[PDB]
Design a protein around this ligand. Structure first.
Ligand code: HEM
Length: 153
């Protein structure tokens, strides 16, 4: 619907299972990115010039870890305040995605890699409720980001 408290708890929980194994789950996420769009390898500074996705790289891990934490924090905010707030950070995030060559058409790629990562994290605990929770938070955060992108390009 638009982030009920039970949806918000499901996101927080799954997020906590994600961050219990950062090395594994962030390796997995980038595999799921290149399986959807092999061309995306080149947008990524620590992926470029590699064969396979590094398994123990700190920059890959800190990056993929901020990405997930931002969606999870958008979902708590949609559930608390009813919106995703535009702040320094997300306007900065609009400029950086612009610099790197990210386009609007790119956003569904990262969406499907997050949904698929999360389904492998929770395993048997996966639900349609959890899936649709992650979907709303992502899509609400991509709107605000794309907005910030667009003002500059
Ligand atoms: C809601 C969705 C998104 C979130 C929350 C997000 C979050 C981030 C964050 C936090 C960073 C690092 C910024 C910094 O600290 O410099 C970043 C960088 C980046 N994002 Fe995203 N991102 C999203 C969508 C996208 C999509 C669709 C693409 C395209 C494939 C993408 C590609 C990149 C690239 C290429 C970088 C550059 C990092 C580097 O090379 O070191 N992002 N994103």
């Amino acid at each position: 619907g638009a982030l009920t408290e039970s949806q918000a708890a499901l996101v927080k929980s799954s997020w906590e299972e994600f961050n219990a194994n950062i090395p594994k789950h962030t390796h997995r996420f980038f595999i799921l990115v290149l399986e959807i769009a092999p061309a995306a390898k080149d947008l990524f500074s620590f992926l470029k010039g590699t064969s396979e996705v590094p398994q123990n790289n700190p920059e890959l891990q800190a990056h993929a870890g901020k990405v997930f934490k931002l969606v999870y924090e958008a979902a708590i905010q949609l559930e608390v305040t009813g919106v995703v707030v535009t702040d320094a950070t997300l306007k900065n995030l609009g400029s950086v995605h612009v610099s790197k060559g990210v386009a609007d058409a790119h956003f569904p790629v990262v969406k499907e890699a997050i949904l698929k990562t999360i389904k492998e994290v929770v395993g048997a605990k996966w639900s349609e409720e959890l899936n649709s929770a992650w979907t709303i938070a992502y899509d609400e955060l991509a709107i605000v980001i794309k907005k910030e992108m667009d003002d500059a390009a």
